[PDB]
Nucleic acid binder design. Structure first.
Lengths: 50, 206, 151, 262
RNA sequence: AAACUGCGAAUGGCUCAUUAAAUCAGUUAUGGUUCCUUUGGUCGCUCGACUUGGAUAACUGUGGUAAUUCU
RNA sequence: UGGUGACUCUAGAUAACCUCGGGCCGAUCGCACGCCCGGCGGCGACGACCCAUUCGAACGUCUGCCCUAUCAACUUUCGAUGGUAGUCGCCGUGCCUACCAUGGUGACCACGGGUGACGGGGAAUCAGGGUUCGAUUCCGGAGAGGGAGCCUGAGAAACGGCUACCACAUCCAAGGAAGGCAGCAGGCGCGCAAAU
RNA sequence: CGCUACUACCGAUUGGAUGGUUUAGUGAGGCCCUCGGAUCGGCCCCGCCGGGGUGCCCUGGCGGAGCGCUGA
């Protein structure tokens, strides 16, 4: 289960690999065009909504 | 896939004909409009030649005619009472060509006091309260009063039309196809039309 | 005698509810009659002028035109209403056997109530029209009586 | 066929296009225009067979869009433009003009004309129409809609139009005693005088036309082009003046020309 | 070049399975209707801004499926 | 006003309508140069309501198709015949609805069946008459395995467009994906029988 | 009547098969109508300024839309 992250304020894209099932529990059971607090990806991803 | 061919059916002698070519595109048919009443909805469909035909599904008002002195005003559709084709098509509120409906009597009445200056409607026991028409009666000259007097020297109509005018609804007929142009035009019923269709309604409702 | 069915029958050229000065007598209650000359040297009869029948497929008082072919035939049966069947007897030639054969091709034409003095065997002429029915294409222009019937 | 045809076979061409057989499969189908398909003549056919200015189908295209050929005062860049009866064609640089008149046989003929005669064109009115705000209209046989005509122009007359302004200069009335010629049918190109005009209600009204030497023939009403008022023609007639020589006199004339030529 | 837009692909080519007043042939009519393109006319006839708005291509960058003129 | 053999034809007048899926009345592009006190000009390209024309298409009128009686009656509230009024269709019309009358074809062969039947212009033989063939280069019609439905477009029930059924069939990590040579060459089958 | 071969015919097996019409029932897909509203835009308040005009409007945003209107 991969993740593609784009930053629209400068148009920079990269992909990260998430092999841990506990990090994607917040992502599951959601629709499109909704804001999810990505507070589980890591220490530098505190206070991010995607 | 509704076809309009003349080769699905038997011949003049009664013998069956065998079809040789399938359904073409000029040979086309479409489902019925079933023009109801309510807030106005009109759809467009592209036809042969690139033209458009307005499919009136629901409508409110109509542009009827009253031919005794040739006036036409926009008039609201009230209720359908008779259809010469199908007896089910009065139970469902459907509009077709040469159909029999009731329309409201207000703008023809306003035209009647504003042109002929005689009261129409306004049944006894309640007179003209909001004081607008006698304002128009006053501040005239002698020539204009002579012109109105020579005009209303002959101001007689049918008594059944008068009774419909106290009743507030005029029995009307539709002379337009709503599934082709999208509007509901026509003319009000007068003369022998009124007695014939009133006889038909009183025979059917009895 | 008229107004038999569930809708009013009228001629959509004239206005039948003109407002007179009086709406009484002496000038009213004689409705105008719509008629036209069909052409091709044919003369309209008086029954289409002073009659009271209402049609939409009559060549004289109606909305149908006359163009194309002019044919003739003998009236065979008068069973179905407002239209009749005529019989055309013609001769066919064979090149191999230099001898003729007679053939008949009966077909249905339209009879307006203007011509009601029609019995079996009367010679009529017809003119081509637009299709008025599934098998009806022709309108009768005049009627000619057969032999006898001196009464 | 689900749509309009766009090709035309060589043996399906009309005979007056005057082609051969063992050259190609197809024939030039003209673009849609004022004239019908079976009554017109493509510009490629004329430039490649009659005037012999070009030999292939590309040379005709080069001459055509080189802006060298003018059609009724207007330059045309279509190689398959329909040219019909009295279509005035002009070449501005070598100073030649041609008028298309049917000759004594059933075909077109090359006919060089002076430029002073190339300024106008005789054409036949087809029907009379009334416009929107009460404007009378004329429909001409080459589809020229002319506003505000003369009040004495009837259904089967002939008007003369200057090619620079599009207006009517003079006209010929349809009457017996006028010079006439036929456009279509078994008779074609014969010049004669109208004598009789039989009226049949509901069908074609045949007429009777007498030649200038004693021959007579009958054609339909649509097969009529009035070209003169009396005996003098209003345009320059081609060689032979349209007399329709029979096969015996044609054989005698050819034998006399062969004997005189040697 | 690419790509957006517009036009053409309903033409041409091959075959004779169906179809016996059906197809087709000659002769008529659309006064009972639509018509791409070309041609000609109309395009200040109506009585009430010295040029407006935001979306997508092509492009850049980043990906999935074994696989497509896929996205 | 004008016309037809003939209009409920065109034009004229009055009173209105003018659809939110909405009629038009130019927010487009290039070349050559400019006169007259910022205004003002020449030739084109594109687009547009309407009208006629051109290419046509489509529905109808009259006449004409091979054999068979071991097919003599057929159709008929599962429209067959006609009338009234409507729906739909670009238009007429049982094309289809609701109501009426029992009509319509037939020994002059209807109906039913068969066809080794696409139709015609034509081909072979032929004193005069005829007989047989016409799948085949030009014209018209029908189909793209066979029925059914449809988007776009002026014009398609289009198949070198799409969508499901069955017959048949390709690739595969087995989850899925992709097609119809009665086009030109070519191959198999079928065959007495037909090419790069 | 005796022998060989062949042709069709009748016939148990209510044999096998290929096409069509059809009672009744099911019926994918498209089309039309009634609903359905995931998602995407625009205007009026809070917060900062630079104002000509003589503490107030033209100028730029996000968090709550106030789930207010309206369009696809």
């Amino acid at each position: 289960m991969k993740l593609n992250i784009s930053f629209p304020a400068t148009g920079c894209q990269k992909l990260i690999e998430v092999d841990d099932e506990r990090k994607l529990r917040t992502f599951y059971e959601k629709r499109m065009a909704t804001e999810v607090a990505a507070d589980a990806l890591g220490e530098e991803w505190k206070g991010y909504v995607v | 896939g509704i076809s309009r061919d003349n080769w699905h059916k038997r011949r003049k002698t009664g013998g069956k004909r065998k079809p040789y070519h399938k359904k073409r595109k000029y040979e086309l048919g479409r489902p019925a409009a079933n023009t109801k009443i309510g807030p106005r909805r009109i759809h467009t469909v592209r036809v042969r030649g690139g033209n458009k035909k307005y499919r009136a599904l629901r409508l409110d008002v109509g542009n009827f005619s009253w031919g005794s002195e040739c006036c036409t005003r926009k008039t609201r559709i009230i209720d359908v009472v008779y259809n010469a084709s199908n007896n089910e098509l009065v139970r469902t509120k459907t509009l077709v060509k040469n159909c029999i409906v009731l329309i409201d009597s207000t703008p023809y009445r306003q035209w009647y006091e504003s042109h002929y200056a005689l009261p129409l409607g306004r049944k006894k026991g309640a007179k003209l309260t909001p004081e607008e028409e006698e304002i128009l009666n006053k501040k005239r000259s002698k020539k204009i009063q002579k012109k109105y007097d020579e005009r209303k020297k002959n101001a007689k109509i049918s008594s059944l039309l008068e009774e419909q005018f106290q009743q507030g609804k005029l029995l009307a007929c539709i002379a337009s196809r709503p599934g082709q142009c999208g509007r509901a035009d026509g003319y009000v019923l007068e003369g022998k039309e009124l007695e014939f269709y009133l006889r038909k309604i009183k025979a059917r409702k009895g | 005698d008229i107004q038999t069915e569930r809708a009013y029958q009228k001629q959509p050229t004239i206005f039948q509810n003109k407002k007179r000065v009086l709406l009484g007598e002496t000038g009213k209650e004689k409705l105008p009659r719509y008629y036209k000359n069909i052409g091709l040297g044919f003369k309209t009869p008086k029954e289409a002028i002073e009659g009271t029948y209402i049609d939409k497929k009559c060549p004289f008082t109606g909305n149908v035109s006359i163009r194309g072919r002019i044919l003739s035939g003998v009236v065979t049966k008068m069973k179905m209403q407002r239209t009749i069947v005529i019989r055309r007897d013609y001769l066919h030639y064979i090149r191999k056997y230099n001898r003729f054969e007679k053939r008949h091709k009966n077909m249905s034409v339209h009879l307006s109530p203007c011509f009601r003095d029609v019995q079996i065997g009367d010679i009529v002429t017809v003119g081509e029209c637009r299709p008025l029915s599934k098998t009806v294409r022709f309108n009768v222009l005049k009627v000619t009586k057969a032999a006898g019937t001196k009464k | 066929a689900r749509g309009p045809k766009k090709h035309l076979k060589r043996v399906a061409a009309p005979k007056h296009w005057m082609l051969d057989k063992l050259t190609g499969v197809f024939a030039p189908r003209p673009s849609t225009g004022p004239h019908k398909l079976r009554e017109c003549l493509p510009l490629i056919i004329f430039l490649r067979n009659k005037l012999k200015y070009a030999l292939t189908g590309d040379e005709v295209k080069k001459i055509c869009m080189q802006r060298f050929i003018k059609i009724d005062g207007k330059v045309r860049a279509d190689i398959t433009y329909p040219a019909g009866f009295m279509d005035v064609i002009s070449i501005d640089k070598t100073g030649e003009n041609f008028r298309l008149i049917y000759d004594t046989k059933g075909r077109f003929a090359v006919h060089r004309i002076t430029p002073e005669e190339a300024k106008y064109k005789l054409c036949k009115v087809r029907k009379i129409f009334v416009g929107t705000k009460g404007i009378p209209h004329l429909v001409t046989h080459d589809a020229r809609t002319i506003r505000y005509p003369d009040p004495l122009i009837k259904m089967n007359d002939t008007i003369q139009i200057d090619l620079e302004t599009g207006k009517i200069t003079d006209f010929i009335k349809f009457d017996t005693g006028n010079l006439c010629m036929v456009t279509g049918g078994a008779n074609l190109g014969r010049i004669g005088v109208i004598t009789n005009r039989e009226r049949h209600p509901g069908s074609f009204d045949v007429v009777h036309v007498k030649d200038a030497n004693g021959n007579s023939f009958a054609t339909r009403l649509s097969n009529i082009f009035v070209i003169g008022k009396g005996n003098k023609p209003w345009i320059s007639l081609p060689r032979g003046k349209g007399i329709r020589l029979t096969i015996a006199e044609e054989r005698d004339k050819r034998l006399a020309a062969k004997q005189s030529s040697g």
